[PDB]
Structures are given as structure tokens and as C-alpha cells.
Amino acid sequence: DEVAEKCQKLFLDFLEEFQGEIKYLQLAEELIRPERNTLVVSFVDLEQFNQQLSTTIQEEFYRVYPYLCRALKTFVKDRFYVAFQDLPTRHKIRELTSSRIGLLTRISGQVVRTHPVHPELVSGTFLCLDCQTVIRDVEQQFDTNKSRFVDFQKVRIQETQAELPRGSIPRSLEVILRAEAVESAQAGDKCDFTGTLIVVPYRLVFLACCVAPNQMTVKEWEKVFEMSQDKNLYHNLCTSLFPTIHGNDEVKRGVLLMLFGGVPKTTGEGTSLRGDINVCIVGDPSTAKSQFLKHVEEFSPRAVYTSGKASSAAGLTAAVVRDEESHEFVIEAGALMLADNGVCCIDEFDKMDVRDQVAIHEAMEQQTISITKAGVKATLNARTSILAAANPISGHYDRSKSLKQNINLSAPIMSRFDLFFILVDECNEVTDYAIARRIVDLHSRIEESIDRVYSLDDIRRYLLFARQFKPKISKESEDFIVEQYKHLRQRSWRI
Amino acid sequence: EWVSMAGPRLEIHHRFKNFLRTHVDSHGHNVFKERISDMCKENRESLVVNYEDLAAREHVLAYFLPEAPAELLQIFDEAALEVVLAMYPKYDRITNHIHVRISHLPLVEELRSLRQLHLNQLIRTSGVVTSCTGVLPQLSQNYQRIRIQESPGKVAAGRLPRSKDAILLADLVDSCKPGDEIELTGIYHNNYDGSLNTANGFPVFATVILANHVAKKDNKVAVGELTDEDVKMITSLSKDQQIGEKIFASIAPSIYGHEDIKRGLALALFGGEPKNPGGKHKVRGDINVLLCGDPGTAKSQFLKYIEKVSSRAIFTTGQGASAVGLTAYVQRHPVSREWTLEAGALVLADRGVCLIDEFDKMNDQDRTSIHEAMEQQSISISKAGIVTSLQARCTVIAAANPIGGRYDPSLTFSENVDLTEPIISRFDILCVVRDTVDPVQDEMLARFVVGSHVRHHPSNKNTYGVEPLPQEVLKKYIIYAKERVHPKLNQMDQDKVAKMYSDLRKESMATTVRHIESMIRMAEAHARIHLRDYVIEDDVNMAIRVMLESFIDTQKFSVMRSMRKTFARYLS
Amino acid sequence: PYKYQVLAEMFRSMDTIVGMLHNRSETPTFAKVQRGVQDMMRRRFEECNVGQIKTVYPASYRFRQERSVPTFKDGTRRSDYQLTIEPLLEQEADGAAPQLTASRLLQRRQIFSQKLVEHVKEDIEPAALPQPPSQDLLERIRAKEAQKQLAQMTRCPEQEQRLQRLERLPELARVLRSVFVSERKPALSMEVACARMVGSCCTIMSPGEMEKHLLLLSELLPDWLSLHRIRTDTYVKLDKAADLAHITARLAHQTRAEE
Ligand SMILES: Nc1ncnc2c1ncn2[C@@H]1O[C@H](COP(=O)(O)OP(=O)(O)OP(O)(O)=S)[C@@H](O)[C@H]1O
Ligand SMILES: Nc1ncnc2c1ncn2[C@@H]1O[C@H](COP(=O)(O)OP(=O)(O)OP(O)(O)=S)[C@@H](O)[C@H]1O
Ligand SMILES: [Mg+2]
Ligand SMILES: [Mg+2]
């Protein structure tokens, strides 16, 4: 292939002339290190240096990759594998078709299963048993001492929830990792893999090379700065986050606070203190019990929604299922572990059986879930914030009975919610007028009846910027908290 | 390749013969002649040679052994065989082949650390045995195939335990049992398997270790690894008159108050001395602790701290623990399809500690299997035509919440907890924790909690009045006390305990032998705390005090006042 | 001396560990060397004694601070510096890679002992190891200022919005080019192109904003980028051979002019 040799020469040119310091000289020198055998090359540098080479590599990656490896070996020997990063285009798993075979693309998914590291024989030195002829450098079409082996890892990935179209089963894909890409991915993580779609006998498999998990523009940064100095920022955010909901602003403040969340702390004894907030809303019907769940689900991309009775114990935390091909037992993820570092919303929490809530118990407080079933022993992180919605017994708050008799929930469950709001409906003419006018205005004037102080994207950016700070507690705050807790505890839902 | 040369090969063989017939220990004794005489007396088929002495004497042999294991080991086996024939010509009649075993390899590697570079090299590894096959004959020999998983204590949280295959020949056959922690020195070879190649779609070699030496990982190795500075620090701590106070205060610094619970848990952790009087009945030397608590008392925090401290620890939850999961079960192997035993949580908890959370959620059917392991510390599995016995010497700490979420002081302890009487009887220490509204105690709790919160910020990163010990120092003290002390009860006044037990019978029928046994092993553990070869009666007094406190804590309010009045002599 | 004897013994242990790590193509880290020495001699190992060795015979090793050292599944972050040690060996004339043979080991321990004897003939200070890198009047003045600022902002807001968008046009344009590089197509619809750009842009934006930005690009720079109205849709065509640097310069000039 003449074009392959041209690509090799052009890659040598890029390695030898890219710059006032050549970025890749130190990387090539470190490639001499035995633990380092893959080179990471930015795609943007390749495309800016020249465009014909960039297009050729993006189009015939499988065709020229061994020539790229040969170029790397030649460049290093003058004084090994090639990895690429920062491809500007993201693609969906449902987009993977046969027309894209051999193209350098990066795919986003979630790792669900992992397999141990295996040696893969690349070039084998074969000894003939008839004439004792040694055949060296035999490539494999998919003497151990003199042959070459490369570390291998197999990964099974699943479609992301956001990209999943309604009513569709999330397809799974097999990913092959080699050399430094081995063991760089962990089960339950979301990753973008850069590589190609190869043809296995047929079968569809992705060969990957890399994994994925101050510089902001001036105007966005200045908008964030300006809105950070607002004196009425709290109320403005509360109003903008729920423009169509009338009253009940305490619930708005609570959900905003749990969106912000606290800081987790780990003691010297290794014990982890939960830095999250769990919220329970219980109320008579016709209130806004659900709408908050939908708003927080649509706003936060890391939100998961679920119903009460339709969810089983296995579906919430995790399940143990036997794998068909491996003839062993593996773990299928539940909703809680998929909602990691996010928010999980449960509707009609009362209808859930006690057998399910007792399973929730561990993830509620210890923030982790442990499984000891059928010879499978594991612990998994469940760092989630739970928002639960429910109604009182018989659907109506009966004032003829005590407050405790009006909630059919266990004592620890009542204890483990930070905020517990109870909503009571009353017949007032002014409230009726306000509710009716708001509803009819929304029904008639859909868009012109919305006044948002800040954009939803702006709120998201501000929240992302704010969540990384870790404030310190002052001594004045310390003794104020001490005295406030004194007064509060000196007076069902025990404190 | 260079070793395969005939000249150097033969010369090294004779040099190894001279090493066998010439080495002198520090005491002037030719050790290998005593070893070979012992082997001849025992009619064994293997010889054990220390790698350290060989490295000290012949550096070239120590360099060659990890690099060319199979050929050099075969040559050494031949040399040992001919040395035996020259020394004991008749020994050919009892054995035809003798194998050389290499022990104490300096390089120890983990199952996770196995790569391509270690292929066909002698490696030392550590782990726990999970399943084993039977003795299989070969048309060459004895065969054993075993499956080894990583030790659960060494495995970090959130990551599955990996498993490997191991092969034992002749003498090494049946030298280990499932659930036994062992270290191995063996060759990391690769095997050709076409099924893996077809499944994965590319050439894959299943790496299987051929072990040369097997050594069960008793705590003797841990004792050997101890630095003499650790021993001197432990001894200096032992002479302190307030060693007990600081030891108790060193547990759960982040939790305020609750002296009795930490006292009982430490006393159970140090453990008693298991005994086998006559080999007819076995008296357990283990303490089973039950913790019944009102919500909000940080029971899970105590369990987590115990999980972290213990060298060997397994954590289980109530809902996720089935009867099959906790115990070993029989399964058909997916490849070879012979019946195999997979160890449960308790089996892997042997010599370690097992924690049960929300024990009140246990199904009664799952509860039934527990009593056998609790009473006898051994499990007999009779399934699918296979009857086996496995060791279950473990210390069990169980947590529980009263029915209804609140402990009623007007009822008996049996009524408040949904557990049968035998289960409670198997437990040695019972601790109930209640919630009281005390303003001064509330102030203390709030102040301590906020102080701990301030201390342990990542940016920033007692009742007895004694300074807590460092965690590493406490762990080293625990290990040394577990592995050195064996107290003797030669100075106990039987009349006092007999009268106390008669009073206990009177006041229990007004409202057993295993209670006496629990108190005895409690006194033994308290003596072990002070590193005393003989038990002083102060240990007995403290054990009586804490046992009486635990007993009165389980009674109704209308009678505990009378019990305290009657037993004010001992509680004071 | 006894301290010098301990120094020589641990130097021998260090040399053995370094040779074992280096002969199998493995990078010698400080933690592995410390673990090996502690197992071999049952004694504490620390950087002060390494600095003492460097003071005694500095030619033994080269000490470096390095990153990107694979520590297996130990949970170690990448930003953690690691102190690596490289043995300093004379290159043989045979062309083979130098290896710490037992002869070289004996030579090194003999030279270390000779240096110790020379020091006696004359504690050792450790060498510096490479460290890792009225109220009414005020209210009326405020009201006057607010009225003046309101009169200032009576100018059409869109005048600044375009300016805002003018700062966003270049970068997005780059992405657009890559999009047409990726799709192997001469022209694309508004919907698919906007969806892909949003899915690849660094900023979360609405499809309508992308459409308005595309319209602004078409109106400012028609020669590069063309729009064709077909049936019920508008399609986008671009010239892929144009130099991006000159176009970026033109966009910067246009933004400056609009300022
Ligand atoms: N304050 C309010 N502002 C605007 N609409 C409201 C308000 N309160 C009630 N509504 C309307 O009433 C509906 C009832 O809200 P939902 O949360 O769906 O019902 P619910 O109270 O959760 O009862 P369940 O749990 O579904 S049986 C809302 O979807 C709104 O259309
Ligand atoms: N006495 C205490 N001193 C200090 N912190 C405490 C104390 N009691 C509770 N806490 C804190 O409360 C947190 C939650 O307590 P938990 O362990 O969940 O309560 P619990 O007693 O175990 O009852 P359950 O099992 O959760 S129903 C702990 O992680 C501690 O931080
Ligand atoms: Mg609802
Ligand atoms: Mg708890």
C-alpha cells in the first residue's frame, strides 16, 4: 500500500516537526520505559498540522495503524503502540452501522460487566514437528518463549439512559482493550472509547485505545460572576426553578438545597459521613406531589425516576443473575447504583412493601449496598439522594386521629429523612382564585406567561461551579449550632 | 538455554550434591542429614530445602532457580534420589522418585499482580482455598486440582475476588483443605485451551500455577514478620497498670460514651482459649455478641469499625444473606462437572470475625443452620452424596433492632426481640441500648459530634481520662496477645462461684452451664489482655461484674432493682 | 563503625533490589525498594539513609521525580509524584544493554566499603534528594443614576446579543468544519447538523440558538457558507478547501468592526 507508506512518512514528519518545544519528544523518551508502551496523540494537533493525513487516518485507521506503529518504532529507535484522543465528534451506540467499519470514532456508554486480563498471542514462533523448522513472526487471524504476547481486557457496555429512545431495549456492545487500556475501566462507570468497529466472525465488536470519564469563555464567566453577587439570588433561583408552581416555596427551598448538597467527610477511623440530603413529601392528593419529581428529573441530567409498587427489591439495589455464556453468576445493576452521585425519585412510596424498604435501608444511611448471595460477595457504592413522594393513610389526613396514626411508616425510615414535609389542603377563596387563574393562564398563554430570572442552562452551570467548593465551619457557627440544637432537642419524629 | 549445555548442567548437579553433603549450620549440624533421616523414618516422598541458605552459599543457583525452574528442579530431584540411594540403598524399595521442595521464596506476589512477565517462573503467592477436586490417577501419579481466591481481608472494597487454578502432584495431593489460608511457591505456566480461543475469538492461554511448596498461612508467619521494636513496645505497654483503660478508650474514638458495649466487644475480640477436654467434647473459646439497640445509637458505626480493625473480617447484611450464601454449598463445576464445595461467609470467617447486620430480619429456616456452627464451630455438609466437615471457629457479632422500633423496659428481653430462646442462649454477651432525654448528656453528645466534624474536614486534613493508643499499635498488640498468651486457671476459688451460681439459679427460677463457660473464657480473655501466663482473681471479678450487668440488663424493670440490691456486693 | 556497617549492609540490599527490579525491565520505585529492604533486613527504611548513601557514593544512582507510574489497582491518583532510582552503569563495548551482574554488584559494595574506610580515615550528613516539583439625598441620587442607566439601556438589546454571538461564532465554525469532514457529504439539513453540533459543542445550547448562529454565519460570510431552500427545508453547504486561519482573521476583524 503506497498510501500506507505515505501515511507512515507523514506521521514521522508530524512526530519530528510538531511544536517552541516538540511535545512528543519527552513522551517518546518515556516510551523506552518498560511500563510505558503506548503513545497518546491529540487529534487536534494532527488536523492542524495537516488535513490530508488527518482525514486519511480518520478514514483508514485500520489500514494504516500498523504503519503508524512502525513509524513510532522508527522514531523511538532513532534516539510500541499509538493512542489517539480528543476526537471532536461523539456518536451513539444505535448509530453504529456497517458503513462505519474502519472509521476512527469514539463511543459513549456505561460499563456493566468486566472480564479478567488475558494474554493474547500476536506474533507466534511456530516449530514444525516434521522438519524442525522454526517459523517466526506469524500474525494471528483472531514456541511460547519466543512469541509476543499483549495484555487483553474484554468489556461489556450498555447504552446510556438519556440516549435510550422510549420503549427500546438498550443494546450491549463488546469492547476490546489492549496494553495500557487494560484495567483502566471499572464496572458501573460511564466512559467514551476511541477506536474502531471491527468485524468478528458475523459479530460486531469495538476495538478501543483510550478511555474517558479557568478556560471558560469570558462572557459566561462574567455572567456567573454577576449572578453570584446577587443579593436576592436565593429567592430568584427558587422562583425561576419552578415558574409554573404556585406557593409551597418551602418545598422549593428544600429541593434546591438537596440539589446543592453538603460535603462528605471520612473519619480517621475510615468511617464515611454522608454529605447528601434525603427528602420526603407526604400530602393529601391534588397537591404538587409529582410535579416536583418531574421538574427535578427534566432539569438534572443525573436524575432517575421510578414508581413504588412496580419496583422489586432486586430492581432497586442490584440482582444476581446467571450469565448464559460463562455459566457463572454475575450482578445486574439496580436503579440506586445507576443513580450514583445523582438523585433518585420514588413515587407512591407508601405502596412499596416492607420487604423492599428494608432493602433500601442500607443505601439510605451507609450509602453502600452489600450482596452476599449464592456464593457472590460484593459491596457497591450507592451515593444517591432520595426524593420520596407519598400520601397519608386512606388518602386523607383525618384530624380526628393523632399525627403518628396518620403515617404508616417505620420509625427508622421516618428518622433517616433530613426534611419531612406534610401538606394539608384547605378551602380558601383567595387560594382557589390564585390556583384557578394560574392554571387557566398556563393553559391559554403557554409561553408568554413565563418569566424566568435566570436561564436553566445558567442555573446548571452555576450549580456545577458551586458544587466543587468545600466551606469551612466557623467557631461562631459552631457554638450557634450547639445552642440551637440544645434548644431544639430539649423539646413521633424524634430528633 | 545456557543451562541446557551438558557440561555446566552436570557440573551444577555435582555442585548441588556437594551442597547437600557439605552445608553446615550455625550450630555445626549438617541439617539435611537429619532431615533425610527423618524423611526415611516417615517414608515421605519429598525433601524441603531452604532457599535462603542456598542463596547464601551458591548465588548462581539462586539466580538460576527462578529462571529455569523445571529442568533445574528435575536435576535436583535426580541428585537427591542418588544421594538417598548412596546413603540408604534400601530406600529404593519404598520409594522410586523423590522431589525437592523450595521454601521461603523472598519474592511474594498477589493473584492480581500476575502478568505475562511471570510466565514459566517460580512465584510465591498467598490466598485462601475455595474448592478442591479428588485424587486422580495418571498414566505417567496423584493429581489434585484446586481453586484459590484472594484473601478477603487483603481485597479492597468494591472489587470482586479473583480466582485461579492450582495443581498438586503426589505428596502435595490432599495437603490442603477448602477454606484454608495458604501460601504457595510454584511455577506460573500457561496452558493451551481451544474453548477459550473460540469463545473470546483470539488466542487465549489459561494460566495455571503448578505449586512446588504448600504452606498453610497460620499466624506463625505473622509472628515472624513482627519487628522486635513492636515486641518491646508491646511489653512496655503490658507493664502499665492502666493498660486496660487505655485499650478500651482506644476503640471507637469518634463515638461518645457507651462504655459497656466497647468493653464487651473488645473482650470478645481478644478471644478466649478453645479447649478439647478429653477429645470427647470440645469447649469453644469464642464469644458471640448480640447488640440490640434503639435507632440512633451508631451500631452500624461500631460494626464498620470492627470490620476495619480486624486483620480478617467479612461484612454481611440481613437481607442479602441466605442460608446457602452464609455456608458452603455443593455445585457442579461448569467445565469438569464434578461435585465441588464453595465456601460461604462463615467458612471464610474461620479464625476471623463475622458481622451480621439486622439479624432480626433472618428467616427462621436460615436461622436453623446457624446453631450448629455457633455451638460446635464446625459445619457438616451432607449434600449430593458428599459428606464433609469444615472448620467454623469464628467470632460472631450480631446487631438487632426491637420489634416496633422501641425497646420496652416493661417486658422481658425475649419478648422485645423476635429471636428464639436457643439463639439467645448461644450468645455469650447481650447488650441493649436505649435512648434517654438527658440535657447534660445531650450537650456532651452535641459538643463531641461537632468537634469531630470540625477535626475531620478534608481541608483540615474521654470517660476514663486515658489517652487512646494508635491504631497500628493496637493491631500489633492484638496480634501478639492472640499468638503468644495461653493463660491457666490454677487459682480460682470454686466455692465463691458455686454459691454465686446457686444464687443465679434461685433468681432465674424466681423470674446454665454455658454461662459458666462464657464467664471462664471471659476471664481467660481478660487475662490475655494483660499478657499474663496465669490468671489473677481480678480477672474473675471483672468478668463476674460485666456478666452480672449484662444479665440484669435483660430483665424487667420491676425486678432489676431487687437484683441490684441483692448483688450490690459484686457491682460495687 | 556499627552505623557504617549498617549503612553498607543496607546499601548492598538496595543494590540487590535495584538490580532485581531493573534486570526484568521494571521501573524501580521507592516504595518497592523500601518493601524489599524491610523484608530482607527486618529494619526501617527511609529517605534519610538514601540521602546518606548519595552523600557517600553519589555515582551509584540517579534520582528523579516522575509521574505516570502504573501502580496497578492501588487507587493512586495520577498527580502523585514518585521518586524513581536509575542505576548508573558504564556502557559495555559489546553494544548490549548494561545489566547488574554479580561482578558489578561486588565491585559496587567494595567501592562503597572503600569510601566508608576513607571517611573513617579522615554521622554522615544526608544528601539533598530531589524533591517533587441624609437618606433622602442618597436615595434621590441613586434614583437619578438608575434613570440615567435606564436611558442608557433604552438602546436595543439585540445590538449586544449579536456581539455576544459574535464571540461564539469562530469556535463553533471550527466544529462545523469538522462535522462536514466527518459526514462525507456536500450538504446537510438544519436539523441533523444542529443536533450534531449541540451534541459536540462545549456549551449546552438550544437548537434555535444554533439556527440563529448559522443564519448569522451565512449572512456575514456568504462566500464560504451557502444555504439552499429546497421544498420545506433549508440545506447547508460549505467549501472545505478554504483556509481556516484567514477566515478566523476575517471573523475577528468583523467582530472588531461591530464593536
Ligand atoms: N400549586 C399548584 N400550581 C400549579 N398547578 C398545581 C398546583 N397544585 C396542583 N396543581 C395541579 O394539580 C395537579 C396535581 O399534581 P400531581 O402532583 O400530579 O398530583 P398528586 O398531588 O401527586 O396526586 P397523586 O400522587 O398523583 S395521586 C398538577 O399536575 C397541576 O396540574
Ligand atoms: N452516640 C453517638 N455519638 C456520635 N455520633 C453518633 C451517635 N449516635 C449516632 N451518631 C451518628 O449518627 C449516624 C447515624 O447513626 P446510625 O448508625 O444510622 O444509627 P443506628 O443506631 O445504627 O440505628 P440504625 O441501624 O441506623 S436503624 C452515625 O453515623 C453517627 O455519625
Ligand atoms: Mg402525584
Ligand atoms: Mg445502624
DSSP string computed for B468-496:
PPPHHHHHHHHHHHHHH---B--S--HHH
Residue B565 in contact with partner chain C when CB distance is under 8 A: no
Please give the Cα distance from C27 to C30 (Å, whole number).
Answer: 10
- Asked whether the beta carbons of B185 and B124 are under 8 A apart, the reply is yes
State the cell numbers at A300.
438534572
Count of other CB atoms within 10 angstroms of residue B354: 24
Instruction: Indicate yes or no: CB of A205 within 8 angstroms of CB of B201.
Output: yes
Interacting residues of C99 by C-beta distance below 8 A, sequence separation 6+: C23
- Measured between beta carbons, the chain C residues lying within 8 angstroms of A55 are 181
Partners of B121 on chain C (C-beta within 8 Å) are: none
In whole angstroms, what separates CA C84 from the centre of its chain?
20
**Contact (CB<8Å) C69/A218:** no
A interface toward C at CB cutoff 8 Å?
Answer: 30, 33-36, 47, 55, 58, 88-90, 180, 183, 217-220, 457, 460
Phi (first) and psi of residue A193, to 5 degrees? -115, 130
Q: Which of A255, A289, A291, A423 to mutate to test the pocket of ligand 1 (most atoms within 8 A of CB)?
A: A291
Contact residues for A327 (Cβ-Cβ < 8 A; gap 6+): B334
Look up residue B125 and give its amino acid: T
Taking the CA of residue A217 and the nearest CA in chain C, the distance in Å comes to 9
A197: number of Cβ within 10 Å:
19
Q: C225-236 burial, b if ≥16 CB within 10 A, otherwise e?
A: bebeeeeeeebb
d(CA B136, ligand 2 centre) in Å: 55
Q: Could you give the CA distance from residue C46 to residue C7 in angstroms, rounded to a whole number?
A: 12
Beta bridge mates, B199: none
Indicate the helix (H) or strand (E) that contains B8.
helix B6-22
Q: How does DSSP assign B378-406, residue by residue?
A: EEEEEETTEEEEEE---EEEEEE--TTSS
Count A/B contacts: CB-CB distance under 8 Å: 160
Question: How would DSSP label each residue in B66-94?
Answer: TTSHHHHHHHHHHHHHHHHHHH-GGGGGT
User: Residue A3 carries which side chain, given as an amino acid letter?
Assistant: V
**Is there a contact between A36 and C68 if contact means CB atoms under 8 Å apart?**
yes
Cβ density class B37-48: b for 16+ within 10 Å, e for less: eebbeeebbbbe
Q: How far apart are CA A388 and CA A278, in angstroms?
A: 8
Say how far apart CA B560 and CA B434 lie, in whole Å.
16
Cross-chain residue pair C73–B117, CB shorter than 8 Å: no
For residue A126, what are the β-bridge partners?
A135
Å from CA of B456 to ligand 2 middle:
17
Residue C180: name the closest of C169, C172, C188 by CA: C188
Q: Name the phi and psi angles at B219, rounded to 5.
A: -70, 0
Paired with A138 in beta bridges are A124
Q: CB count, 10 Å around CB of B343? A: 23
Q: How far apart are CA A264 and CA B457, in angstroms?
A: 9
Q: Closest Cα to residue B175, out of B139, B127, B124, B211?
A: B211
Query: Are A90 and C26 in contact (CB < 8 Å)?
Result: no
C-beta atoms surrounding B439 within 10 Å: 10
The set of chains that have 3 or more CB pairs under 8 A with B is A, C
- Tell me the C-alpha distance between B442 and B266, whole Å: 26
Q: How many Cβ atoms sit within 10 Å of the Cβ of residue A8?
A: 20
Between helix C158-183 and helix C190-200 the angle, nearest 10°, is 100
Contact (CB, 8 A) for B213 and B125 = no
| 3-state SS assignment for residue A198 | strand
Max CA distance (Å), chain A: 103
- The Cα B33–Cα B376 span in angstroms is 43
CB-based burial label for B549 (10 Å; 0-12, 13-18, 19+): middle
Q: How many CB atoms lie within 10 A of CB C4?
A: 19
Contact A138, A126 (CB under 8 A): yes
The single-letter code of the amino acid at C251 is L
Distances (CA, A) of A239 to A235, A249, A345: 6, 8, 22
- All residues of chain A having their beta carbon less than 8 Å from the beta carbon of residue B203 are 120-121, 124, 140
Q: A-chain residues within 8 Å CB-CB of B252?
A: 269
- Beta-carbon contacts of A264 under 8 Å, excluding residues fewer than 6 positions away, are A272, A273, A274, A275, A276, A383
Q: What are the CA-CA distances from residue B284 to residues B375, B394, B515, B522 (Å)?
A: 8, 10, 12, 12
With beta carbons less than 8 A apart as the criterion, state whether B457 and A473 touch: yes
Cα–Cα dist A304/A338, whole Å: 8
Return d(Cα A209, Cα A176) in angstroms, integer. Answer: 9
Of B158, B201, B454, the CB nearest to A379: B158
Nearest CA in chain C to A179: C70
On the CB side of C32, CA atoms within 13 Å amount to 23
Amino acid at C160: E
Residue type, A283: G
The C-alpha atoms of residue B548 and residue B568 are separated, in whole angstroms, by 10
Amino acid at site B274: P
Which residues in chain C (77-136) have CB-CB distances under 8 A to chain A? none
Q: Which amino acid is at A399?
A: R
Name the β-bridge partners of A343: A303, A385
Which is the closest atom of ligand 2 to the Cα of B298?
Answer: 17
Structure resolution in Å? 3.8
What's the distance, Cα to Cα, between the start and end of chain B in Å?
80
Whats the size of chain C, residue-wise? 259
Of B106, B156, B159, the CB nearest to C39: B106
- Alpha carbons A186 and B467: distance in angstroms, whole number: 42
For B497, the 3-state DSSP assignment is helix
Which residue does chain C place closest to A48, by CA atoms?
Answer: C244
- Experimental approach: cryo-EM
Cα of B47 to nearest chain A Cα, Å: 30
Q: What is the 3-state secondary structure (H, E, C) of B151-165?
A: CCCCCCCCCCCCEEE
Three-state SS at B367:
helix
Helix (H, G, I), strand (E, B) or coil at C202: coil
Question: Which 8-state DSSP code applies to residue C91?
Answer: P
The residue in chain C having the minimum alpha-carbon distance to the alpha carbon of residue B59 is C102
What is the rounded CA–CA span in Å between residue C11 and residue B358?
55
DSSP E strand stretches across B86-204: 99-103, 122-132, 136-137, 142-149, 163-169, 181-192
The pairing of strands A279-283 and A385-390 is: parallel
Bridge partners, C228 (sequence order)? C235
- Mutation for A interface: B116, B207, B262, B322, most A CBs within 10 A: B116
- A358 contact partners, CB below 8 Å, separation of at least 6: B318, B319, B358, B361
User: Counting Cβ atoms within 10 Å, is residue C157 exposed (0-12), middle (13-18) or buried (19+)?
Assistant: exposed
DSSP assignment string, A352-407: S-HHHHHHHHHHHHTSEEEEEETTEEEEEE---EEEEEE--GGGS--TTS-TGGG-
A290 lines ligand 1 (CB under 6 A): yes
Name residues whose C-beta falls within 8 Å of residue B66's C-beta, 6 or more positions apart in sequence.
Answer: B107, B121, B122
Amino acid, res. B102: I
Copy the grid coordinates of residue B474: 493496637
Contact of C103 with C110, CB cutoff 8 Å:
no
Beta strands B289-293 and B429-433: pairing type? parallel
Is A326 in contact with A366 (CB distance < 8 Å)?
Answer: no
Closest CA to A256 of A439, A385, A427: A385
Q: Indicate the burial class of A55 (C-beta count within 10 angstroms; 0-12, 13-18, 19 or more).
A: middle
Task: Determine whether the shortest distance from the Cβ of A107 to ligand 1 is under 6 A.
Answer: no
Rounded to 5°, angle at Cα B115 from B109 and B120: 85
Contacts of B297 (CB under 8 A, 6+ apart): B258, B433, B435
Cα–Cα dist B493/B539, whole Å:
13
Closest Cα in chain B, distance from residue C90 (Å): 22
Q: H or E stretch including A305?
A: strand A303-307
Q: Which residues in chain B have their CB less than 8 angstroms from residue C25's CB?
A: 117
Q: What count of Cα atoms within 13 Å lies in the side-chain half-sphere of residue B465?
A: 1
Q: How many CA atoms lie within 13 A of A313 on its CB side?
A: 14
Nearest-angstrom CA–CA distance, C255 and B541: 90
C-alpha cell at A29: 523518551
**Pair A197, A105: CB distance under 8 Å:** yes
User: Which three three-digit cell numbers place residue C82?
Assistant: 514518585
Question: Which atom of ligand 1 lies at the shortest distance from residue A348's CA?
Answer: 25
